[PDB]
Structure formats: C-alpha cells, structure tokens
Write a protein that binds this ligand. Structure first.
Ligand SMILES: CC(C)(COP(=O)(O)OP(=O)(O)OC[C@H]1O[C@@H](n2cnc3c(N)ncnc32)[C@H](O)[C@@H]1OP(=O)(O)O)[C@@H](O)C(=O)NCCC(=O)NCCS
Ligand SMILES: CC(C)(COP(=O)(O)OP(=O)(O)OC[C@H]1O[C@@H](n2cnc3c(N)ncnc32)[C@H](O)[C@@H]1OP(=O)(O)O)[C@@H](O)C(=O)NCCC(=O)NCCS
Ligand SMILES: CC(C)(COP(=O)(O)OP(=O)(O)OC[C@H]1O[C@@H](n2cnc3c(N)ncnc32)[C@H](O)[C@@H]1OP(=O)(O)O)[C@H](O)C(=O)NCCC(=O)NCCS
Lengths: 267, 247, 255
C-alpha cells in the first residue's frame, strides 16, 4: 500500500552452499531484483543498477528458513533513485525472526527510446527524515570518487535469462557471479568453508548486454583477525571485443569473508 | 508423449522430497508438448482440473510422466496426465497422479479431431465432453506476499508465460503460509479446479498473495503487471487458486 | 599462453543423490570453456561440431572446485580443434587431481550469407608446434570415424544469442537420460566413466523439442554401455512426425 515491494523465498538445496547455508550470491541477486522492481514501480520504465552502498550480513539463512526482502524508493532525483532494502530471516520451526541486513542501493531509469522523474510521496515522519538522509548518503556515494598468490579467474556467458527484456545485464546477476568467484579465492586461505560478511560500496561503471562474456578476476587483498578481504574485478567483451582483447571495465568490488569465527582457520 | 526425470537436490525440498511446484511444472510442460503435437502451433494452459498426489517422491527416485490428447474441440484440447515414480534400488513403481488439463491453441486456424483406435480411446473421447461441461460451471493466519519477474526462460518462444511456471511459483508461496500455520513443514495434498483468465508475457511482474483460508486450505492470488501498469498500479488478474495441505 | 579458464564451485544444485557433481553439468561446463576459446579465435558465434573421447579419471564432490582450461591448437577453415583440461580441487584440503584431458571440435557460424576464413594459430612454444602437428592426425581420425524415453523443450538459456542450442546442453540432457537407463538395469546409482567420440549432425534452435531415447547396448560386467539418440523437432515438425537426427552417442557407466 506504501510503494514497498515484498519478496518471500524459502531456501531449497538449490540456493544452498557446501554449508547448507543460503548462497550469499543468491541473496545479493534477490536483493537487487526486489529493489529494481521497487524503482521500476516509481519510474514506469526499465531500471538498471547504478551502484550499491556497503552491505553487512548479520545472519546467514540455513536451508528450510524463509527470507523476506522489502524495498522502497526513498527519494527520486533526476534519472536516479535511492532504494532502501530490509532483509529478514524466519526460522520455520522456532518462529524466530532475525534481521539479516539493512542496505541501500541506486537505480537509473533507462529512456524508452530517444525523461524526468516524479517526486516520491511522503506520509510518515520516517518518510520525511529518510528523504533528507538520502541526499547526504548521495553526497557520500558520489564523493566515493577514488579512480596474496591465490588468484582465481572465471568466465560467464551472458544469456537471455541474465538480462531484462531490453537486453541489459542485471546488477544482481553480476553480483551473484562475483560472490562465487570470491568464495573460491577466499577458500584458498581457509581450512573451513568461509561465509560472506560484507560487500564494500561500489559502482556499475558501464552497460553489459546479452551475449557478452564477463571475465571475473579475484585475489585475496588483506587479512585481519578472523577475516579475509577479496577484490573482484569484472570485465566485459562482446564477440568482437573478445577476439581483439579490448574489454570494458564493468566494476570492482571488495568482499570480506569470515573464516567460521576462528583465527586458526586461516594461514 | 513421455517424459522421464530423475530427482536431484536441485529439485528437492528441505527434507529431501521432490518439490510439488517442480512436479506441477514438469506436468504442464508435458501436457503442453502433448497439445503442441496436435495443433501444430504454440499452446497455453487454459485451465487445470483437480490434481491430487497419492505419493510424495524423494531424491534418487525417478518420475515418468505420460500425457495424451483425448479430444480436440474448436480451439481447446483436453489432456490426460499419468505420473509414475520408480525406486532405483527397489524397482517398485507407484502412482503419483491421475489429472486432467485444458489447453488453448494460439495462432499467429482450426484443430482436427485425434486419430481414435482403442475402445479406451472412444471412452475418454466421450467422457471428455462431460468433463468440459464441469470445467465451465465454476461461476460464482497471516498473509504471505511475494513477487516474481518473468524472464525469457519462463515463457515459450513467442513470449507467453508457461502456466506451469505460475503453478510452481504458486506452490512456493502457498507452502510458506501453510508452514506458518503449524510452525512446521507440510506437504501438498491437492490443486483444486481453477482457470487462467488472461495472458502473461516476458517482462511481466507476477505478484502472489497467499492467505490461510480454513488440514489447511491456502488461497493464492496471481496478479500481473506491465512495466507501465506497475507504475500506474492497475494490473490484470491472472488467477486465484486453492491448495490443500497436511502435516 | 592463449588459454580460456573457468573456475566453478560445486554446489548441491549441481549434485546428485550421493553428493557428486552431475556429469551432465561437467560436460556442459566443458563445452562452454571450449566454445569460449573458439570464439576468441574466430570473432563470431561458434557451435559444437564434434567431441572426441572424454574419460573421467575422478569424480568431484560438493564443496570442491572444478577448473577448466581450453586452448585452440589449430584452425583449419571453418573448424578448430580445442584442447581441454579439467582439474578438481578440494576447498578444505587444497589437494588437486586430474579429472580429464580431452578434445573437441568447433565450427564458426556465419552471420548472414558470409564466407568465413580463420587465421592460423600463433605458435610460440616447441610444444605449440608439437600440438599443431598432432591436431591433423586427430582430425583425420575424427572424420574417419531396460530403456528410457524423455523430452526437453529448448528455451533461451539453452542456446546462444543467435538461437543455436549449445552442444554442452544436449550433452547434459544426454547423461541425465542415460543414467536412468543405467539405473534401470542394475539397482544401484552408477557413475559415468567415459563418452565415446560423437559428431553433431544437424543444428538445433530455440523452440525445438528434443526427444531422448537410451538403451543398454553392451555389458562387459562392472561396465554397462548405453547408447543415446537425440531427435529434434520444430513446432510444426512435432505435429507431423518428421524430425532430425541430431546425434547418437555411447556412454560407459560404472556400478
Ligand atoms: C549509472 C550510469 C548511468 C552513470 O552514468 P555517469 O557516467 O556517472 O554519468 P552521469 O554522472 O550523468 O550519471 C547520471 C546519474 O547517475 C548518477 N550516478 C552516477 N554515479 C552514481 C553513483 N556512484 N551512485 C549513485 N548514483 C550515481 C548521477 O547522480 C546522476 O543522477 P541524476 O540523473 O538523478 O541527477 C552508468 O555508469 C551506467 O549506465 N552503467 C550502469 C548501468 C547498468 O548496465 N547496470 C547493470 C550492471 S552492468
Ligand atoms: C558439423 C558440421 C559443421 C559439418 O559440416 P558438413 O555437413 O560435414 O560439411 P563440411 O564437412 O564441409 O564442414 C566444414 C568443416 O566441418 C568439418 N568436420 C565435419 N565433421 C567434423 C567432425 N566430426 N570433426 C571435426 N571436423 C569435422 C570439416 O573438417 C570442415 O572443416 P574446415 O571447414 O575447417 O575445413 C555441420 O554438419 C553442422 O553445422 N553440425 C551441427 C553444429 C551444431 O549446431 N552444433 C551445436 C549443437 S546442435
Ligand atoms: C480461455 C482463454 C484462452 C480465452 O478466454 P475465454 O473468454 O475464456 O475463451 P472462450 O470461452 O470464448 O473460447 C476459448 C476456448 O477455451 C475454452 N474455455 C474457456 N473457459 C474455460 C474454462 N473455464 N475451463 C476450460 N476451458 C475453458 C472454451 O470452451 C473455448 O473452447 P472452444 O474453442 O472449443 O469453444 C483465456 O481467458 C486466456 O486468454 N488466457 C490464456 C491463459 C494463458 O495465457 N496461459 C497461461 C499462462 S497466463
């Protein structure tokens, strides 16, 4: 009733990892879908992931638990929108609901052919305060203007199910693909299976489309306490660019992984 | 038209049982491939009759599905569906479902009658008329909300959403509402007579809304939205459905 | 080098009842890395022409990582030979093993009514030259060379952006049907050991139905050979009966 889009996923073994936990990559993908739908409700046209803020993961959902994602447009700007993301997890046996993640993300309306956005409607006091908090967070976003022998290369062909019906590659899918490569790199240092704690704020620097090859390069970047930092770099190539060897930088993220809450589990 | 699929973790539920939605999907695909062998063109699910599951299938087992066109009408076709499960260590086979479905042809033309041969062929050919009569008569806890975005793999090559994809997404949300009643994990008993009352297409958003209605009965609502319609909040009602569970 | 490299973690979604990687998925992944290598050479869409002997010396498990390297060893005119290497690593132990060394052939598909002419492969190593030689001997060999029914509908993710059904996709559906037939003979879950050389005869396309039939062919005990047929139908072809022989393959399973 309040322009809040709601998803609900039960976690099958399909979404599961070697730990029986929900794949972090999948959560990222679901978060981006729900948020996009939130934006596309405000815009009327297709919207693409512009950037993500930092995401922290408080809990990881196990198989047999239900996840509930809620997204909302907090503020509309000129072509862009701030979308707020809440993520819960409910154990179907205990009844307990816990918070997984509060998160922010940015979407861009894509022109129909060859256009301005309406203002978001504010009813509550939370609406009016977050309306202002978005402009401060936006300053932070834009000012973010800064431009180990355990390497891992992967490659994914962008098929039609990985993109909207105009053919633009989904933000969430590149994030899902990133995360699995990152895990492979992080595991080269752990004696346990490590789980994702956070993704540092990053930007989608340019478009990707059906039939691109996305190349993922991952390396461990740092070690701290119980955790390990992995940089992933994403590059795009259409069929011709792929042969010539002149790709396009799509993004770079830093994912921080937790070695099962023990110092001993990493070298 | 025969389809055999083995049950793998990809298809399984939390307790290692083959997911009902996954079955419903495999039923439609096969029931659709039956219809498409008769019309020559693409076909879409018009309606579903009572489905009832006598057995639940488990990882490692194999499901065999048989579907055939009983009677072609003016633009629609009645299809029969048999569902067998086999154990690959026992050899034992068990019946999962006897179910009927109705498909409409979608030209971009008329349909010939089918080639009848058996005595049993004629019997189903006559009883289909009664069944079509019943199919047409349908004329009058906590709410679980979910949304799904229709991608290319969720539709035929012409862009039309599979009926079976909708029933699979329907089961996911219905199970959650059921689980939320008894604080446990249940299994699907049946799918009651409903009708898909409008098309759906790639790019649609399907909003699902499940509520506990009364052994439990989950009512699922499927509402469809353009990217434009999504903005204007005026969508299209695809279907309502009633699913019954035990725990 | 000139190597296309893919790394995949084996989740339960890629797995079987035991906790092993489905051979179907492995084959699909191998066809992709090889296809990516061909296209890096050709600069256009490439399809699977044929596959040599593939033998799996190990099976991987959930929570392990498969790494595939693919290289174009020689280009001819429309076709290229691709050398493939598959390794598996345990994510906890860190121990690696050879899964498979195999060979596949890819053909460059024209956009319009286009004549395609592939450039030579840049040779650097002495092993490069050795491989360029032995490619022709393998190319010559190539050109010289109870039961389960199933059906799959070709959708968008099963074909490249032009609409041509991937070789690896058919190769996946090809094992999932064979496994059941091998399960129907002896009452135990078996694992795939090798795939005998087979060619792709006709192209397939988005919207097709592929009908799969498999039978036990020959059983020298502790081994059961199972042949697979693959038959493709347009939507209209479907309703009339006349279809196309895509491929017939022989799979060796193990009890
Ligand atoms: C997002 C994108 C449009 C930014 O364009 P740009 O080169 O920065 O040019 P501009 O500065 O004019 O961007 C226009 C808008 O983007 C916003 N923007 C740019 N960088 C941003 C960031 N890091 N975070 C949030 N918003 C950002 C600007 O604030 C501006 O907003 P406004 O129109 O409401 O005033 C561009 O990088 C892009 O099209 N790539 C991602 C699209 C995509 O394909 N996403 C899926 C992943 S491949
Ligand atoms: C395989 C195919 C290319 C062979 O074509 P053809 O009818 O035999 O005609 P040609 O022999 O002239 O084919 C041209 C090339 O195919 C090669 N060829 C044919 N079968 C081959 C095989 N078994 N192994 C290696 N090369 C083969 C020839 O050597 C020739 O090579 P060149 O052009 O580099 O000199 C063709 O039948 C085809 O399009 N197959 C299906 C491809 C496909 O769609 N696969 C994806 C999954 S269905
Ligand atoms: C049935 C439908 C195809 C056409 O609308 P309609 O007004 O009900 O169609 P009509 O009754 O005028 O005629 C179409 C045929 O479908 C049959 N039909 C209509 N309602 C039916 C129902 N409740 N149950 C079974 N068959 C039904 C009719 O008997 C008629 O058969 P005929 O050609 O032999 O006379 C439907 O409303 C529709 O367009 N939705 C298609 C569903 C779809 O797109 N696929 C599923 C994913 S959304």
């Amino acid at each position: 009733s309040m322009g809040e889009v709601v998803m609900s996923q039960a976690i099958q073994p399909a979404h599961a990892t070697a730990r029986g936990e929900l794949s972090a990559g999948q959560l990222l993908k679901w978060i981006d879908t729900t948020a996009c739908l939130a934006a596309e409700k405000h815009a009327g046209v297709s919207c693409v992931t512009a950037s993500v803020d930092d995401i922290q993961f408080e809990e990881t959902a196990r198989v047999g638990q239900v996840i509930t994602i809620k997204a909302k447009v907090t503020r509309a700007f000129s072509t862009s929108m701030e979308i707020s993301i809440k993520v819960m997890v409910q154990d179907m046996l205990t009844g307990i609901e816990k918070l997984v993640s509060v998160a922010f993300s940015t979407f861009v309306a894509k022109p129909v052919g060859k256009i301005h956005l309406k203002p978001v409607t504010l009813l509550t006091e939370q609406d009016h305060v977050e309306h202002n908090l978005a402009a401060e967070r936006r300053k932070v976003r834009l000012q973010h203007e800064d431009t180990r022998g355990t390497s891992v290369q992967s490659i994914e062909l962008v098929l039609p199910p990985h993109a909207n019906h105009h053919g633009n590659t989904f933000g969430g899918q590149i994030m899902a693909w990133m995360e699995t490569v990152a895990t492979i790199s992080a595991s080269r240092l752990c004696w346990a299976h490590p789980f994702l704690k956070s993704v540092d704020m990053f930007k989608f620097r340019g478009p990707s489309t059906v039939g691109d090859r996305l190349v993922f390069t991952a390396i461990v970047n740092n070690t701290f306490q119980t955790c390990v930092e992995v940089g992933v770099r994403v590059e795009a190539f259409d069929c011709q660019e792929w042969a010539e060897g002149r790709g396009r930088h799509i993004n770079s993220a830093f994912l921080i992984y937790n070695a099962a809450d023990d110092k001993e589990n990493l070298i």
